[PDB]
């Protein structure tokens, strides 16, 4: 009687819910991907900056020690801080992003096609 | 003797409405975490970009002073690396954070009021 | 007819328990990914702050050496530079949201539907 109408309702609601969860999972995956990419770029930008900063300080302290050695001849050593141990680590969540997209596609096999 | 089926329907509906509730909470927490990650990633991107610009300014000022000192020293008796190309990109996932918060609210329309 | 109804109820319960299972796995993977992001964002933020401090130290030492060279050259015959110590990288705290996700992942077990025969 009404039991059948209730079963149709549950199934429809449940299939609606899953559809929305699928969309939510795929958006989560997207958001975690864009974070992964930008976090890693920013890590690499920092690590490139560090290497080029070490290079610049190496060149500066060389020139300064020359100038001080020339002032010695005309009239103790300049040692700048080492900033090459500083490193930005990268993040690897590609496994979790894949898993989210997998479950998003897998949830199609969780839908209800009731017996007419 | 259709009592078992109606009590099963009531169980399914309660369990479902419970589950969706928990998911709605999980979706909101996700959206929150992505929002805080977006804010901090973007602040840290800017901090790096502000550093890089004021570092190019400083090295400019140094190389100027060094060239003046080397000319002075010749009369009594350098070019260093550019890092302005180093730039931290920013992230835009406010679209995906929206879509999570939308689906969290929209799941209220997936809930079940059983008929009787 | 009441056979079809019962078999439909079984189907609904098995699909539902299926779906929830997959979602639990998805919530755990989300929590993982936010955890690894939080750790790496925070390590990067500290690396930048440690770089800023050591850089301000190096520029202090350079401008000191340059001012001495300029005073020597004036005796044979302060001009300083930009402050960066102000620059600071914030840290992120989402351990509350990660905890909640794993909480909800476990709590969904109480939403499942049991062997009724
Ligand atoms: Zn969809
Ligand atoms: Zn000497
Ligand atoms: Zn934001
Ligand atoms: Zn030159």
Author numbering:
A (entry chain B): 914 to 988, 1162 to 1202
B (entry chain A): 912 to 988, 1164 to 1202
C (entry chain C): 912 to 988, 1163 to 1202
Study authors write:
The 6-HB structure formed by HR1 and HR2 regions in the S2 subunit of HCoVs plays a key role during the viral membrane fusion process, which makes it one of the most important targets for drug design.
The crystal structure of HR1-L6-HR2 shows a canonical 6-HB structure with a rod-like shape 115 Å in length and 25 Å in diameter. Each pair of two adjacent HR1 helices forms a deep hydrophobic groove, providing the binding site for hydrophobic residues of the HR2 domain, including V1164, L1166, I1169, I1172, A1174, V1176, V1177, I1179, I1183, L1186, V1189, L1193, L1197 and I1198. Inside the fusion core region of HR1 domain, there are 8 different residues, which may contribute the enhanced interactions between HR1 and HR2 and stabilize 6-HB conformation of SARS-CoV-2 as revealed by crystallographic analysis, compared with those of SARS-CoV. K933 forms a new interaction with N1192 in SARS-CoV-2 with a distance of 2.7 Å, whereas the corresponding position in SARS-CoV has no such interaction. In SARS-CoV-2, E918 is mutated to D936 and binds to R1185 in the HR2 domain through a salt bridge 2.7 Å in distance.
